Amino acid sequence: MIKQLFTHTQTVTSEFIDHNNHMHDANYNIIFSDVVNRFNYSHGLSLKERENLAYTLFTLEEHTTYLSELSLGDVFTVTLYIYDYDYKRLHLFLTLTKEDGTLASTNEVMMMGINQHTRRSDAFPESFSTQIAHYYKNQPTITWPEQLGHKIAIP
Amino acid sequence: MIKQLFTHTQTVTSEFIDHNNHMHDANYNIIFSDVVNRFNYSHGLSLKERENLAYTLFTLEEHTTYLSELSLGDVFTVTLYIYDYDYKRLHLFLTLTKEDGTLASTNEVMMMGINQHTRRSDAFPESFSTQIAHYYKNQPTITWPEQLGHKIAIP
């Protein structure tokens, strides 16, 4: 009945602004990465848990789209969705929106679980796997934006 | 006869390293963005030229792949290729390789030219367009990596 979304809100500061007088492209990636980490830290793989379990997550692949510029002082929210997952991979889709609801940017990311003894991929620990399944189950249906899965191409 | 590639080499420093003890995912994007800018600055759109022409370039879309980890002290090179271009868009593909030749990361990016009076898209100025065409013409054929155009998906 009550669906839930992990979000993080913040404001565009001076240090994020480029010579085009808006937020620099790579700063979007810095943000998205940090929100992903906040999520994973709160869903079974905090840094302490990673040390105890000898387990971590590596980024494999990501796709970022820049739809609408963000200026100095703009307050924005990042929202995380789980698009897909399996026994050792997480396929995430994040939106970055302005206060009025304008989709400013999107990020699609594939992460993979890694056994720290071997630095080879391996199944998620059960606590993480449970928490991920629960989040996905309990997340709002969304009409997936056309950015999702989009191939880069000159029209 | 003599083909040419724009490149930039640097070393992994402490500030790039995450809690996984390798270069943080988003730092790859910071690097790739800066190399793209170095290229554009040297091919007809330096900051001075952008001010004189009232013209700039915005990032629209990018895709980054993380293939092989980079550690503290690792020396790497970024190489820029033009995959495609039209009258106001540039479709780039960059490789990031270790000294032995190991493909560590790839970046595919779409940039678009912007008229600064209107902040609307518009054809590249001729000097930039000429320089871009020449670079593409004079660049080595490469067997395009399977990363290029790759859609994110759990197998």
DSSP track, A3-48: ---EEEEEE--GGGB-TTSSB-HHHHHHHHHHHHHHHHHHTT--HH
The structure was resolved to a resolution in Å of: 2.0
Residue A130, SS3 per DSSP: helix
Residue ranges of E strands in B67-151: 75-85, 89-98, 103-115, 120-121
What are the structure tokens assigned to A47, written together?
């840094």
Architecture in CATH of B1-139:
Roll (3.10)
- Determination method here? X-ray
Contact B135, B7 (CB under 8 A): no
Taking Cα atoms as reference points, which of B6, B12, B8 lies closest to residue B34? Answer: B8
Q: Which residues of B touch A154 (CB under 8 A)?
A: 84-86, 89, 91, 110
Strand partners, A7: A79
Residue ranges of E strands in A38-102: 55-66, 75-85, 89-98
What are the structure tokens assigned to A15, written together?
């240090």
Contact A95, B93 (CB under 8 A): no
Give Cα separations from A64 to A74, A135, B75 (angstroms). Answer: 19, 23, 26
Give Cα separations from A103 to A16, A65, A99, A139 (angstroms). Answer: 19, 10, 10, 19
Q: Report the phi/psi class of residue A44: left, alpha or beta, with left for phi > 0 and alpha for psi in -120 to 50.
A: left
Q: Which residues of A touch B25 (CB under 8 A)?
A: 29, 33, 59, 62
What are the structure tokens assigned to A115, written together?
């056994």
Asked if the C-beta of B19 comes within 8 angstroms of chain A's C-beta atoms, the answer is: yes
Q: Please report, as a single letter, which amino acid is at residue A102.
A: T
Binding-site members of A for CoA are 59, 61, 87-89
Q: Please name the residues between 43 and 62 in chain A that touch chain B, using a CB distance below 8 Å.
A: 47, 50, 56, 58-62
